[PDB]
Amino acid sequence: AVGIGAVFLGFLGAAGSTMGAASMTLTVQARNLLSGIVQQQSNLLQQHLLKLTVWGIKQLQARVLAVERYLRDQQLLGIWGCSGKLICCTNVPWNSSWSNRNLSEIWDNMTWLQWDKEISNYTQIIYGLLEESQNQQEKNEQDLLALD
Amino acid sequence: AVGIGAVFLGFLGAAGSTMGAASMTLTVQARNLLSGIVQQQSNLLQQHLLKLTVWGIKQLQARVLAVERYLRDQQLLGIWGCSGKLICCTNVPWNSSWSNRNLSEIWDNMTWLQWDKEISNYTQIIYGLLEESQNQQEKNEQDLLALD
Amino acid sequence: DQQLLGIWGCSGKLICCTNVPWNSSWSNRNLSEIWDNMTWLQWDKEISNYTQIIYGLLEESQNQQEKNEQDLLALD
Amino acid sequence: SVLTQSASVSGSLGQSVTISCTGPNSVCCSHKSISWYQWPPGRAPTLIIYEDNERAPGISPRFSGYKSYWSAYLTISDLRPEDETTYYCCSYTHNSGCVFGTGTKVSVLGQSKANPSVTLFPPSSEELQANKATLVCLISDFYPGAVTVAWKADSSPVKAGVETTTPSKQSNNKYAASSYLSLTPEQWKSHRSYSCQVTHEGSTVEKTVAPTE
Amino acid sequence: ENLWVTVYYGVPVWKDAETTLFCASDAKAYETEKHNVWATHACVPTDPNPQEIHLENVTEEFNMWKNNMVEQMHTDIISLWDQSLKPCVKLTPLCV
Amino acid sequence: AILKCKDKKFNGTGPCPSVSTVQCTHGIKPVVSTQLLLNGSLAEEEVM
Amino acid sequence: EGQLVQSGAELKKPGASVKISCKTSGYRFNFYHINWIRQTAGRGPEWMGWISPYSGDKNLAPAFQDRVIMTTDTEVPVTSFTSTGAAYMEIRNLKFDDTGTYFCAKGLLRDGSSTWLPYLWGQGTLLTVSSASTKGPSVFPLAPSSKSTSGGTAALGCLVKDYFPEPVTVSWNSGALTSGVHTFPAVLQSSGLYSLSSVVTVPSSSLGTQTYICNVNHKPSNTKVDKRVEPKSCDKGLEV
Amino acid sequence: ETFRPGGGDMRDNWRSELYKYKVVKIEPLGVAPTRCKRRVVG
Ligand SMILES: *[C@@H]1O[C@H](CO)[C@@H](O[C@@H]2O[C@H](CO)[C@@H](O[C@@H]3O[C@H](CO[C@H]4O[C@H](CO[C@H]5O[C@H](CO)[C@@H](O)[C@H](O)[C@@H]5O)[C@@H](O)[C@H](O)[C@@H]4O)[C@@H](O)[C@H](O[C@H]4O[C@H](CO)[C@@H](O)[C@H](O)[C@@H]4O[C@H]4O[C@H](CO)[C@@H](O)[C@H](O)[C@@H]4O[C@H]4O[C@H](CO)[C@@H](O)[C@H](O)[C@@H]4O)[C@@H]3O)[C@H](O)[C@H]2NC(C)=O)[C@H](O)[C@H]1NC(C)=O
Ligand SMILES: *[C@@H]1O[C@H](CO)[C@@H](O[C@@H]2O[C@H](CO)[C@@H](O[C@@H]3O[C@H](CO[C@H]4O[C@H](CO[C@H]5O[C@H](CO)[C@@H](O)[C@H](O)[C@@H]5O)[C@@H](O)[C@H](O[C@H]5O[C@H](CO)[C@@H](O)[C@H](O)[C@@H]5O)[C@@H]4O)[C@@H](O)[C@H](O[C@H]4O[C@H](CO)[C@@H](O)[C@H](O)[C@@H]4O)[C@@H]3O)[C@H](O)[C@H]2NC(C)=O)[C@H](O)[C@H]1NC(C)=O
Ligand SMILES: *[C@@H]1O[C@H](CO)[C@@H](O[C@@H]2O[C@H](CO)[C@@H](O[C@@H]3O[C@H](CO)[C@@H](O)[C@H](O)[C@@H]3O)[C@H](O)[C@H]2NC(C)=O)[C@H](O)[C@H]1NC(C)=O
Ligand SMILES: *[C@@H]1O[C@H](CO)[C@@H](O[C@@H]2O[C@H](CO)[C@@H](O[C@@H]3O[C@H](CO)[C@@H](O)[C@H](O)[C@@H]3O)[C@H](O)[C@H]2NC(C)=O)[C@H](O)[C@H]1NC(C)=O
Ligand SMILES: *[C@@H]1O[C@H](CO)[C@@H](O[C@@H]2O[C@H](CO)[C@@H](O[C@@H]3O[C@H](CO)[C@@H](O)[C@H](O)[C@@H]3O)[C@H](O)[C@H]2NC(C)=O)[C@H](O)[C@H]1NC(C)=O
């Protein structure tokens, strides 16, 4: 209806804003990602026998896909050492053949969507060892160094 | 049958005990929360064709609701920085218009159920920024301070 | 499974060190004698019987009463 | 009992003195925790502090619990005379009862005075049908609530038959007590009129009933 | 004298829940005859021991009249009958 | 979780002082009966 | 915010034994212990012992170990957050050193030390023991008197003659007049009973639209007679 | 006053032995106030 301007800004409300602005609004995304219970109730908000109407089970397929792609996403975080923590710093340098531009030149200049588009091709290969050189051989260390 | 008194005390066995007592028995709850495999087996513990008896799929609806409400609960912990850790300390002060009473006056005096009842109304509003003022702007800090 | 890790303080971290000693009535052999000598399957087979009982308190003596501590010691 | 308290304590508006009290090694000094009570005589009590320094809710920060190794104290502050009556001390250990005290009453000066109120009731008609009488004439609305009061028929020494009470307090601020005079029938209209003299350190008021009327 | 508000996982706490429940019964092989009315072969077997544990000094409401598990427990019984019947023979050539 | 009540003189509704925790019902046999019940549970009490 | 109420406060002869009790209202009774105390004039406030309503763990005072034997009833729940449950405590002292007023009330956290605290107090029954037996109430009026003829206020009252064991409660119009109404404690005649006075102030113009009725009531002599205070005064000041 | 067995509905058959039982939700997470807090990282 008529626009009300009381709350700011909202889920993906920073998609049209640069990465620096949205980098601060990471949580108005993280809660809306998984929650398939706030919006769908275990029991409803008598002629029918059982509820295998296809409103029933293809709602049912949706709820798990809601979680599993989250659940495998957050496992990637469990691979890289960031489980309960939304941002994550990183040890292996960036050799910039994936992008030649600066630090200001992205957070102030572009947006998140406008950054994936360009390295969408280099995406899989990086995730190869943001754990291996970062975590696979981060903790044989404190294995071999808490050894004493 | 006749009561046997060998094990102590059990799942929610500290619900009738004060918060301090139950605060130590947080794990006899955390394992019984999700485990829908210990009690339900992937294959059973030949005339039938397939098992779409409604024992089959409304058992099936139950298992995911078992996880997703856990999974969204533990995401709230992932929002507040406590993923693998059951208790969690906290930075933003408590202004006590939500409850005027003391520290001893709850853990020794009341129980957990007997504490939610009174602030059940103030529940949603607090969860607004036990992350924002606690974690949303806890790590732009070490973003801006591991900057060097 | 990963909740068990959330019970023992290892959520995002694949290996995990541990505080309560191993009294070795579960296996009498050495440290080299397993990582260099046997394989993982070849280690579960022998303590598959002692499996449940250990998981009783790799949290209690390790984490259930690891953080009433920093409850009672971040108390100040 | 073994514990010993200060017999009396004093101050006024903006006060900060409290009852204190101690005893021997066996009682109330170190290992124990020790927790005391506002006790109006003839009324239930209300409880300031439950364990040394930190106090039960409802009662507010004017009252501070503190003490060292041989006694116990609880310096009240910013005091209005709603505080005026007894606090007794109390030592206990996880397996034992408490031990309560040997008599305290707060009393503070610097307050505005209050005019006493006296009222004589003659000995009514349905009374010497018994035949026994007693004149009573009771005082309220006065503090310091400590006063002496006399008897007299015909301004000439009478010397048999008067009681008068301990004062007991239930008003918001002020105080009362009671007094009266026992009988032998005629001796009285042997007189001409009466007296219930109320004497304060500030002023002396006297009422007189002419019982011919 | 400063107070923080800190969280805990696994507090003994509960709410009047509306949700769908399931059946568990120790399985009878019973290879002589087959096909029970309700249990059939789909109900899961009860665990060797179901654990019963006393909640001490706990007092909690109970109203068996707007209780829902009955409206469920007959919602079932009507239902699967109408699927224990459907595979069986249809008797309309008999209204002769 | 389900939960059971455990005082014998409990009547139809009210809070139960004696409570113990179950997750799965005791063995209920669905007897199809009208106006009477039988082969059911039996309280150690005087039928209130 | 829970109320606790004992019952009566009356007479007894040295030999026998009477028991007094004290029941919760508005909160749970069981997981909070029991206690009773005295504050006799001779020995001041004094504590005796507890037990637990749940299992029963007593710890009495050496002064009153060998005389006093007591039991308490069971739960009566009100709802998940409030209950009731009885608790009955018998005496046996045969000494008037104990003549005073008897409370019994409780209130605490319960998992720390300080593990008994009396907090939310009962009526305080008043244990009068006597060798003299019960003497019952009679009652006659107090003529109105002038309080301030400038302000137009008067004071009229009621009888409260000598009677044996106090207390003795007296309401007027049976409840609906509590503003300004004032009564005071009794005295002690040298032969051994009480007396006080009863007076309340009202506006002098209130004589023909309101009824004033004091009501005398001592329970152990089970007598209670109600009166009509005659509003016609004899005070010249009030007569103006 | 008179009266008579009715059996108007059957689920009274279910109230027969489903009256001990009552299902209930798990709300397993509670916030509560204590004095602990880990290092303010600033
Ligand atoms: C209150 O509580 C009371 C206490 O329990 C309840 O009392 C119960 O009442 C029910 C009836 O409502 C009884 O069920 C029936 O009991 C019959 C009597 O049992 C006697 O025999 C027992 C030993 O034999 C049984 O057990 C063996 C295994 O050990 C089994 O092989 C054998 O077949 C038989 O079942 C003995 O121990 C007892 O003490 C008794 O003396 C029993 O015969 C009934 O079995 C029938 O009926 C049922 C119901 O349909 C079928 O499911 C069975 O398969 C069986 O039917 C088959 O055999 C018939 C024999 O003639 C054939 O006519 C049928 O067509 C069928 O045969 C076909 O299928 C076979 C298998 O595929 C093939 O081999 C054939 O060739 C055919 O194709 C049944 O069990 C309870 O027993 C009784 N309780 C007790 C403890 O006894 C009371 O009911 C309760 N109240 C209420 C309201 O519920
Ligand atoms: C259901 O309801 C019940 C009650 O309604 C509830 O039980 C309460 O639980 C709390 C929590 O634990 C208890 O609080 C503790 O109580 C300890 C018991 O006090 C000791 O001392 C008693 C008195 O002894 C005196 O009297 C004897 C003569 O009788 C004399 O000779 C002695 O010298 C002494 O002066 C004694 O009776 C009592 O014995 C009972 O308890 C022991 C266990 O300790 C048991 O073995 C016995 O068989 C008997 O049942 C006991 O020995 C008290 O010590 C304790 O204080 C310690 O711990 C705190 C921390 O809590 C420390 O800070 C402190 O420094 C002490 O080290 C604490 O006060 C409470 O007493 C229970 N009973 C009540 C309230 O009546 C159940 O829990 C409820 N159900 C659930 C699920 O909670
Ligand atoms: C992301 O990575 C992919 C893979 O390297 C890049 O795709 C490639 O882009 C080049 C254009 O520079 C394409 O080359 C062209 O080939 C034709 C002959 O087929 C030639 O005539 C043209 O002159 C040109 O060289 C190449 O085909 C293409 N390959 C694939 C698999 O897509 C893409 O450019 C990268 N995107 C960004 C934004 O970096
Ligand atoms: C939890 O928070 C809610 C919301 O503030 C509280 O509910 C409110 O409680 C008050 C009672 O103090 C209700 O006010 C009443 O309104 C009527 C008129 O409708 C008035 O006549 C009464 O005198 C009284 O003022 C109010 O309606 C109610 N509002 C809602 C939405 O429930 C509740 O009290 C809080 N609970 C606790 C335990 O703190
Ligand atoms: C894992 O733990 C189980 C449980 O302790 C071990 O099983 C036990 O193994 C012994 C063999 O040393 C069996 O004892 C035998 O009993 C018969 C009589 O029944 C006796 O005649 C034999 O001489 C022998 O003593 C015992 O029955 C068996 N118990 C169970 C429940 O399996 C098992 O050996 C352990 N495995 C490893 C690799 O440590």
Ligand SMILES: *[C@@H]1O[C@H](CO)[C@@H](O[C@@H]2O[C@H](CO)[C@@H](O)[C@H](O)[C@H]2NC(C)=O)[C@H](O)[C@H]1NC(C)=O
């Ligand atoms: C019928 O009722 C009896 C109890 O009255 C149930 O239990 C039986 O009790 C008798 C003695 O009272 C024993 O001799 C039997 O062995 C018991 N039987 C069983 C199976 O436990 C009996 O179960 C009831 N019959 C049913 C439920 O079919």
Ligand SMILES: *[C@@H]1O[C@H](CO)[C@@H](O)[C@H](O)[C@H]1NC(C)=O
């Ligand atoms: C105890 O309760 C009162 C009630 O407001 C509170 O003021 C006091 O500070 C509490 N004690 C502590 C240590 O906070």
